[PDB]
Symmetry: D2
């Protein structure tokens, strides 16, 4: 369904926040050079 668009492209949002968090955590570790 074009809801199941919405839900899957939410789950986009969440895994690509979790991108952000792990590639923050890249930043912090690579500040501990």
């Amino acid at each position: 369904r074009x809801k199941q668009x919405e839900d899957k492209x939410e789950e986009x949002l969440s895994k690509x926040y979790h991108x952000e968090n792990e590639x923050a955590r890249x930043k912090k570790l690579x500040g501990e050079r």
Copy 2:
């Protein structure tokens, strides 16, 4: 160098932000039904 760690893993943050933006814009277009 472990600065250039920081810069590439900022460029992580920015590209995995624009994940979030495009995969919101999924949500909006797949809302439109």
Copy 3:
């Protein structure tokens, strides 16, 4: 440790293939439009 660099930046590679596969399956479902 710059081995656990290799492993995490493999786990980068594999997740960003599994990006490729899921965003192919985007293309397939948005074919069957």
Copy 4:
């Protein structure tokens, strides 16, 4: 357009290729120890 799905979820494949390449070059760089 559920084509403008096809082209954007192509542009998935290409951005999540450029994931694969940069996060290979992670592995190679984090190889040199």
